[PDB]
Amino acid sequence: QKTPQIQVYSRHPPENGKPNILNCYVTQFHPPHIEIQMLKNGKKIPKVEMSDMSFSKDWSFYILAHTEFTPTETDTYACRVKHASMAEPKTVYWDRDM
């Protein structure tokens, strides 16, 4: 059992009011069963696309989730992960630079 690492970053330079794509890359976890959500102001984004799960040379699993988004300076965005290795969901916020 390995705990997932979560990295959240944008596809393009984040410019306020301009449509973009936010990525949530979840890696280094085992077993493969996982639930990933992306949040806008703490609320689940319904349209989220997920890559096929895969695994690395060390046998740990990884997956990419992404969703369309428009940064502003009034909305927060996060990726939230539920996995057996952790007693509670892990949420990581997009830091507005990444």
Binding site: Y9, P13, I21, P31, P32, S54, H66
Partner: protein, 269 residues
Amino acid sequence: NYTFRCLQMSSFANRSWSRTDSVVWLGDLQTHRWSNDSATISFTKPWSQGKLSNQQWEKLQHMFQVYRVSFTRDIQELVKMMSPKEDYPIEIQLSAGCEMYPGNASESFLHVAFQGKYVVRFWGTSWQTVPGAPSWLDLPIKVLNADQGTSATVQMLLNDTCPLFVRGLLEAGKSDLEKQEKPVAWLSSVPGHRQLVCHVSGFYPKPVWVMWMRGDQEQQGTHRGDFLPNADETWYLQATLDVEAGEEAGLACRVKHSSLGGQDIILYW
């Protein structure tokens, strides 16, 4: 030097629930997917059939179709046999394929992990446990090796089918494998020492150089992050530099990448 990797992930939760999903990679590009939900393998590239005729592809797929059902029943049987020492849930992963070289191009591999630990490989003409694997695998592997037909097929697939197919793939997918996508960069920081961050996104292929400079002098504290994938088969990388406030002036992030052709990105703080 391309590696072709077929990755199988099988989960067995109990006797009435299991799934097997596969993804196939040529270097860092996905070429096939096969979900437990689908009857047939899906192409993720227009060129994913490589140089195989419709008929040869159909035969290869039929073999994988039979294999997927057989594999499932075999593991279910291996558990019945070995239980209680090994019971559900169970995760099995298989990594199989070949790596192509110059001249006559290849080495093949088939590695198997149980519960996330590498335990078995196919090598030479038979399955073998790797040194340090648990002794309960002894009988299952003897039972598996008793299937001479499977061994012959696996040897063929690894020694002959895999390199031939991959030669055709490299040929048919040449334009994509050699595509050039340009990075875009932008700067940021968090506010007394500031961490400066140079973000580079949208580049393909993976090799890139990113560095903080002050004129022509390289900033040795430049720390490169991991390569992170974008969903559109391009890459993302960031490079950071710890600085003292009132020192950012003069600093610049320089980006070199094959797609730029001499027109490096240089972004001044």
